[PDB]
Design goal:
Chain lengths: 50, 116, 292, 32
């Protein structure tokens, strides 16, 4: 995902698989964020990762 | 600085302005070398907004009276936060370059705008 | 020193990043340019077929078809781009123009030149030569109207030299031209783009060997040629823009690959400097410590 | 001062300031 987004930051036309993978990577990077003083248990983490 | 004991409008204003300054610092030398003509419409609009933000922060003080003849200025907090929200919304991008030097208040900014 | 080295590293790394980004910009533009250039083929084929059919059994006489008795002068139009960072594109175009001017100087004629593009505009303004007219601001994205008006102007200028005898304009009242030239670049390949000059002002008839005309065939012929000239002019521009973008991409790719090396060398030099500084520092502190 | 400036600058003078492709037509008629 970094290997694709560092290059195609200024690309409008892409391979469909490349754009989908970029979208997946960006979504995962957005999702991994977490606030402070907020412990998590294993089960909800498994749900979120799934 | 935290929303628990401070209003969240301050928090979001600070976050937006710091992100704007971070991106602007990153794109500084790119604007320097490759030119503004190679940037995107969002790049151009953000660059202009950052120019406005960077020039807007300046304000005069009493102690400068020895050095310059202009007396200083003081401004309360709510007016400043409203002005900063208005700037970061981008509704004042039409203002000229000169109107964004040594501005203490919104009324001073408007009177400077009318002078040109 | 150290801070100068670090700042140069930052500047060169950022230049590397943005050179690759704008090279990708050029690569993306190549696709849409190639998609757009290849849509005017059917109309050109139809206009050619209709011209061939009309002239198949028509009278062979026209001021554009015939030639002037005297070679008084010769017009010429050379194309260029509206953006820099193209590499040798401008250099190739200017070299072709200079070679053509040198070739034309053999006849002793005084030509007049027409140019499209701001870079060549400045280049020729700096030099000692007249330019009657120039066009800029739409080389990146042209339209049929510009080509149509340009073809009209050039055809009128050529017509305006029918009776140019000596220095006398004659009934034309204005000195006209008796020959035209076209300079542009062709897309031979993604890597092969050779500048091409062509002459197409006087029409020539060739027979390779071997309907109804409701209006006047001669009038149809007379109105038909200007459309053909305009279509050729329009077809030239997309080819030129495609060649421009194709030459654009490679120079910036190479700039990126060469910009890597300065980062590498400067990092090596900085490491050597810092280790020398630290070893000198420890040597000096040792000499101070043990001397007492 | 500005009047003298204008008068002098008005009085003062500035000392400076083959591969040639040919496109033809295709006629089915036999060569004359």
């Amino acid at each position: 995902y970094r290997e694709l987004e560092a290059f195609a930051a200024f690309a409008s036309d892409l391979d469909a698989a490349s754009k989908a993978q970029l979208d997946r990577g960006a979504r995962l990077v957005e999702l991994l964020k977490q606030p402070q003083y907020s412990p998590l248990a294993v089960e909800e983490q498994v749900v979120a990762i799934f | 600085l935290d929303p628990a004991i401070v209003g969240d409008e301050h928090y979001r204003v600070a976050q937006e302005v710091i992100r704007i300054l971070q991106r602007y610092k990153d794109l500084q030398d790119i604007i320097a070398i490759l030119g503004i003509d190679e940037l995107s419409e969002e790049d151009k609009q953000l660059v202009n907004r950052a120019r406005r933000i960077e020039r807007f922060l300046s304000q005069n003080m009493m102690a400068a009276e020895q050095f310059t003849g202009q007396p200083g200025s003081t401004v309360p907090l709510k007016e400043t936060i409203e002005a900063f929200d208005k700037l970061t919304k981008g509704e004042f991008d039409h203002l000229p370059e000169q109107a964004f030097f040594l501005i203490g208040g919104l009324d001073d900014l408007a009177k400077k705008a009318e002078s040109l | 020193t150290l801070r100068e080295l670090r700042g140069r590293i930052r500047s060169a790394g950022s230049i590397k990043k943005i050179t690759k980004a704008q090279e990708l910009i050029a690569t993306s533009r190549i696709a849409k340019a190639q998609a757009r250039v290849e849509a005017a083929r059917p109309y050109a084929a139809e206009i050619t077929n209709m011209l061939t059919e009309l002239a198949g059994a028509s009278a062979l006489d026209h001021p554009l078809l015939v030639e002037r008795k005297q070679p008084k002068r010769a017009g010429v139009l050379v194309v260029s781009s509206d953006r820099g960072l193209c590499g040798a594109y401008n250099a190739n175009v200017l070299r072709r123009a200079e070679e053509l001017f040198s070739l034309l100087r053999d006849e002793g004629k005084d030509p007049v030149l027409y140019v499209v593009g701001r870079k060549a505009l400045g280049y020729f303004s700096f030099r000692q030569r007249t330019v009657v007219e120039s066009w800029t601001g739409f080389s990146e994205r042209p339209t049929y109207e510009n080509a149509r008006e340009i073809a009209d102007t050039l055809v009128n200028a050529f017509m305006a030299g029918a009776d140019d005898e000596g220095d006398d304009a004659g009934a034309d009242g204005i000195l006209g031209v008796d020959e035209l030239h076209i300079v542009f670049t062709e897309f031979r390949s993604m890597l092969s783009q050779t500048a091409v000059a062509r002459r197409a002002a006087p029409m020539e008839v060739e027979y390779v060997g071997e309907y109804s005309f409701e209006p006047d065939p001669e009038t149809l012929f007379d109105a038909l040629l200007p459309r053909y000239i305009a279509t050729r002019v329009y077809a030239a521009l997309l080819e030129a823009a495609a060649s421009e973008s194709a030459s654009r991409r490679r120079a910036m790719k190479s700039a990126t690959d060469n910009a890597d090396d300065l980062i590498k060398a400067l990092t090596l030099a900085a490491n050597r400097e810092r280790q020398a500084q630290i070893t000198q520092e420890i040597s000096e502190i040792v000499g101070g410590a043990n001397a007492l | 001062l500005v009047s003298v400036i204008n008068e002098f600058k008005k009085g003062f003078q500035a000392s400076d300031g083959e591969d040639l492709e040919k496109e033809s037509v295709k006629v089915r008629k036999p060569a004359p």
